[PDB]
C-alpha cells in the first residue's frame, strides 16, 4: 500500500542558463524500486530523462530517502514544458505510480 509520488512545484520558472530543480517525493517501503523522471511532449508522448539509481538531467536522493532532486542543468528555452516522475516498485509486487504533472517555464535572459 503506497500513494503516488508528488512532483513539486507545480510551476517552476527559471531563466535561460540557470539550473532548474524539481523535487519528487516518494515514501519508500523498501529499497527495491526505481524512480524515473519523465518529460511529456505536447503530442502526449513521454520521454525518460533520467532514473534513480543512475548529461544535463540529474537525480539526487536527499538524506530522508523520500525526497529526490531532479535538476535541469543549464536549462534552455526549449526545456520549457511538462514534466512528471514515476516510481516503480520491483518486488515483491511490481507497480508504477506516476505523479501529477508540473510545468517548467524557462525565460529569455
Amino acid at each position, epitope marked *: 500500500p503506497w500513494n503516488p509520488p508528488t512532483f513539486s512545484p507545480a510551476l517552476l520558472v527559471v531563466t535561460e542558463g540557470d539550473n532548474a530543480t524539481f523535487t519528487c517525493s516518494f515514501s519508500n517501503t*523498501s*529499497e*527495491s524500486f*526505481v524512480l524515473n523522471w519523465y518529460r511529456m511532449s505536447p503530442s502526449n508522448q513521454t520521454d525518460k530523462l533520467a532514473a534513480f*539509481p*543512475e548529461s544535463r538531467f540529474r537525480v539526487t536522493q536527499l538524506p530522508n530517502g523520500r525526497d529526490f532532486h531532479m535538476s535541469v542543468v543549464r536549462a534552455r528555452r526549449n526545456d520549457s514544458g511538462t514534466y512528471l516522475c514515476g516510481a*516503480i516498485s*520491483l*518486488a*515483491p*509486487k*511490481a507497480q508504477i505510480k506516476e505523479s501529477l504533472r508540473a510545468e517548467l517555464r524557462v525565460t529569455e535572459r
Partner: antibody
Amino acid sequence: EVQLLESGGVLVQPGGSLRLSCAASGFTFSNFGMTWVRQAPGKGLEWVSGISGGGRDTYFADSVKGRFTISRDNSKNTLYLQMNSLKGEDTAVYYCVKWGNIYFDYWGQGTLVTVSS
Amino acid sequence: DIQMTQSPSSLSASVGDSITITCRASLSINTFLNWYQQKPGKAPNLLIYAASSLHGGVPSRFSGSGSGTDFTLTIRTLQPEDFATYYCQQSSNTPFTFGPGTVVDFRR
C-alpha cells in the same frame, strides 16, 4: 562494459553446503539489485533469489527458502549465494544477473553445481 | 505463483520468414513481461522488456506486444542467428517465473 563472472561450482554431497561468488564490473555495483537464476541440464530457467542494491531486501523462490541465503559486499563488487542443506535437484548452472529494474539485462555465463552422492 | 506458458513449444522456419511466439500468464501482469533468447551452451540475453520495449543493441526485427495475460514475440525477416530458444518471463510478482521456452529451428 558489463561483466559478471561466477565461480564456485563443484561436486557436493547432498545435505552439504556451498558458496558461489560473482564478481561484477562495468557498472556501479551498489546502485543495482542483483539476482541468481539457475538452469538444470536440459531444463528451463528458474529464478532463485534476489537482493536489493543496499542489501536490506532479499527474496527467494519457495524451493530454496530456509536453505539458500543471498548476500553481497559492495566494497569488492561481489555477490554471493550461500547454498545450505543441498538436494540433488539443486544440480544446475547458476547464473549471476543484474537486477536494477523490471528486467534482467545482463547475465554471466554461469557455474555448474553438482549435488550427488 | 504465476504460471507462464508458451505456444508453440517448437517451430521450424526459413530465413526471411516472419514468425510469432505466444506467451500466456495465469493472472494479469499488465505489461511486466520480458522476452529472452538463449543459444545452446550460453547464458540468456534480454530482447524485450515491459512487453514491447526493445533492449538496446537488439535488432529492430524483434518486437513484442500485449498486456494483461496474452503476449506475443514477433521476429520479422528471420535471420540465421535467430535460431534459438525463446523464453518469456513475468516481472510482476515474486517469485519471478519463466515460460517453458520455445525452440525455433531452421526448416530444411
